Amino acid sequence: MKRDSRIYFDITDDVEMNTYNKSKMDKRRDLLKRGFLTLGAQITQFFDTTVTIVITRRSVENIYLLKDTDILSRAKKNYMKVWSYEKAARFLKNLDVDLDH
């Protein structure tokens, strides 16, 4: 049987951008956060072993190059789901969630 959905938003980046784009990414984040709250996900402040999903802006295909203490390493070690913002926004759409609204 399944367990409560607990989502951690990775706060670390592996990309550079200007201030404008940061704000735009932060909006995307909050907007996504708001969507998952709606479906009833729990949105945890800290990362730990009870997270079921990490939503990250960083490079998933390159996790193998990360330190062992990096939350993305740990998430993969722990068979958690790691999603990009795109895949996440897909998840919400396909589940009939008004993103625009």
Side-chain angles (χ1 to χ4, degrees):
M1 199 169 81
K2 201 171 178 185
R3 181 169 303 278
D4 286 8
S5 193
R6 299 161 62 80
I7 300 181
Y8 176 76
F9 284 90
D10 187 6
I11 67 187
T12 288
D13 288 290
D14 69 18
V15 144
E16 291 172 273
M17 61 214 315
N18 62 16
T19 294
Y20 182 77
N21 255 16
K22 193 66 217 157
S23 296
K24 191 173 81 204
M25 287 303 220
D26 289 348
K27 281 175 40 278
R28 285 204 196 157
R29 187 199 51 205
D30 300 337
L31 202 131
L32 234 35
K33 201 176 81 162
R34 211 135 41 86
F36 279 103
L37 282 176
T38 287
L39 293 178
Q42 296 163 31
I43 298 174
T44 77
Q45 180 182 330
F46 292 111
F47 170 84
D48 60 35
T49 39
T50 80
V51 180
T52 56
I53 302 184
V54 172
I55 301 190
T56 167
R57 292 190 297 268
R58 286 194 281 142
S59 181
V60 168
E61 316 172 13
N62 288 285
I63 295 178
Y64 77 92
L65 298 153
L66 303 174
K67 293 201 276 219
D68 287 337
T69 62
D70 186 297
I71 71 127
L72 297 172
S73 301
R74 312 185 47 198
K76 176 190 175 194
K77 188 191 182 166
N78 278 279
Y79 308 83
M80 293 169 35
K81 285 135 164 175
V82 183
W83 291 350
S84 29
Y85 284 22
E86 292 61 44
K87 187 172 193 183
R90 271 184 238 123
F91 183 76
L92 308 178
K93 284 177 186 181
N94 299 355
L95 236 35
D96 198 5
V97 180
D98 295 346
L99 278 175
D100 195 313
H101 191 83

